[PDB]
């Protein structure tokens, strides 16, 4: 009941995407469609990974149409309940907007509430880099996004929900953190988080 009391006191809930809202990892899927899974600072790491992948717009389009991500059981109902209670829901990912916006659309989360990296493409579609000015393009991006949300909307209780260390580290500035191990349990998070769940239903009180 304590967990649910906390969860329900939130006026904004930010969800990590990879391994939390969806079962897979966006960049991992993109690597597969481009045929570089075997060959496969945050910003420096991101550049390196994309340097090998070099995804074209057509390839990203393929991923979206051919291999949509699988929403974690219970997330559709959980977000539905949150929205019916007017809780503002956000998606934050070190992944990419083109992919995350599709997950957002399935959950009725407006694109304005999605914070992720943006891939760049040349006129012919070839990989041209990514928007390095995005908060999610650097280490601690999730916390930076939450700080911006707090400064813009003045939420009184913003909670971060995610499976990894980067999510746990988003609190502060988040007011609370709820670890999620429904897809994969990251033990370091489970052992240190004050709140931790393995099924979104547990929040469906
Ligand atoms: Ca994650
Ligand atoms: Cl992604
Ligand atoms: Cl991430
Ligand atoms: Cl993108």
């Amino acid at each position: 009941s304590e967990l649910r009391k906390l969860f329900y006191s939130a006026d904004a809930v930010c969800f990590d995407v990879d391994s939390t809202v969806i079962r897979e990892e966006g960049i991992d899927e993109l690597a597969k469609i481009c045929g570089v899974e075997d060959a496969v600072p945050f910003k420096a790491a991101l550049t390196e990974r994309l340097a090998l992948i070099q995804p074209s717009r057509e390839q990203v389009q393929r991923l979206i149409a051919e291999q949509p991500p699988h929403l974690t059981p219970g997330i559709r109902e959980l977000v539905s309940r949150l929205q019916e209670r007017n809780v503002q829901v956000f998606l934050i990912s070190g992944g990419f907007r083109s992919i995350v916006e599709h997950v957002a659309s399935k959950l009725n989360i407006p694109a304005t509430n999605v914070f992720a990296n943006r891939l760049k493409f040349y006129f012919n579609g070839e990989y041209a880099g990514f928007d390095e000015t995005q908060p999610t393009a650097e280490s601690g991006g999730k916390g930076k996004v939450i700080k911006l949300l707090k400064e813009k909307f003045h939420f009184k209780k913003i909670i971060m929900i995610g499976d990894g260390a980067t999510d746990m580290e988003a609190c502060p500035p988040a007011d609370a953190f709820i670890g999620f191990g429904g897809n994969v349990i990251r033990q370091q998070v489970k052992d240190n988080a004050k709140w931790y769940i393995t099924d979104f239903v547990e929040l469906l009180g």
Side-chain angles (χ1 to χ4, degrees), residues 1-36 39 41-205:
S1 63
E2 200 70 294
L3 172 65
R4 293 181 176 178
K5 179 181 181 181
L6 173 71
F7 181 66
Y8 276 58
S9 69
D11 57 344
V13 174
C14 300
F15 291 93
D16 153 66
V17 179
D18 296 346
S19 291
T20 297
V21 169
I22 60 176
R23 297 183 167 184
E24 313 95 323
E25 175 188 61
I27 188 172
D28 181 10
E29 296 300 304
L30 182 59
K32 298 179 179 180
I33 190 66
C34 291
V36 294
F42 184 76
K43 186 176 179 179
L46 183 55
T47 298
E48 294 179 55
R49 289 176 292 182
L50 288 173
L52 178 60
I53 302 178
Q54 290 183 297
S56 72
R57 186 174 186 296
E58 296 60 54
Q59 283 171 151
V60 174
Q61 189 173 63
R62 281 189 55 193
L63 180 63
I64 293 177
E66 295 176 50
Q67 299 297 309
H70 287 60
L71 288 180
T72 301
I75 193 62
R76 285 191 192 73
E77 185 177 1
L78 180 60
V79 172
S80 290
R81 292 197 181 178
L82 284 171
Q83 296 187 319
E84 293 180 342
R85 296 177 62 70
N86 197 48
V87 178
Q88 300 305 104
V89 183
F90 300 88
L91 296 187
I92 309 174
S93 180
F96 312 103
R97 172 170 294 280
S98 57
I99 303 171
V100 180
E101 291 193 331
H102 273 285
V103 171
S105 67
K106 293 175 60 174
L107 296 167
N108 305 294
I109 293 170
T112 56
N113 290 24
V114 170
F115 292 83
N117 290 309
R118 303 187 75 183
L119 295 171
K120 296 187 179 183
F121 308 101
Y122 288 119
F123 193 70
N124 62 18
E126 295 187 69
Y127 174 63
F130 63 99
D131 184 10
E132 295 169 54
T133 71
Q134 293 289 160
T136 53
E138 301 177 303
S139 63
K142 290 172 179 172
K144 295 175 183 177
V145 167
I146 291 178
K147 181 181 182 184
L148 293 170
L149 289 176
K150 293 174 69 181
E151 303 178 314
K152 183 171 182 176
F153 303 104
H154 295 181
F155 294 120
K156 60 178 182 179
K157 189 73 179 182
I158 182 158
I159 301 179
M160 177 79 223
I161 300 185
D163 70 303
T166 59
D167 304 298
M168 188 164 66
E169 298 182 304
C171 177
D175 297 299
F177 168 68
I178 301 176
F180 183 72
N183 289 301
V184 177
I185 294 174
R186 287 177 180 281
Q187 203 61 44
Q188 69 170 307
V189 179
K190 178 176 176 180
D191 291 332
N192 295 291
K194 303 176 182 175
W195 310 101
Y196 194 85
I197 67 178
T198 56
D199 200 307
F200 284 127
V201 65
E202 181 171 0
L203 295 180
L204 294 171

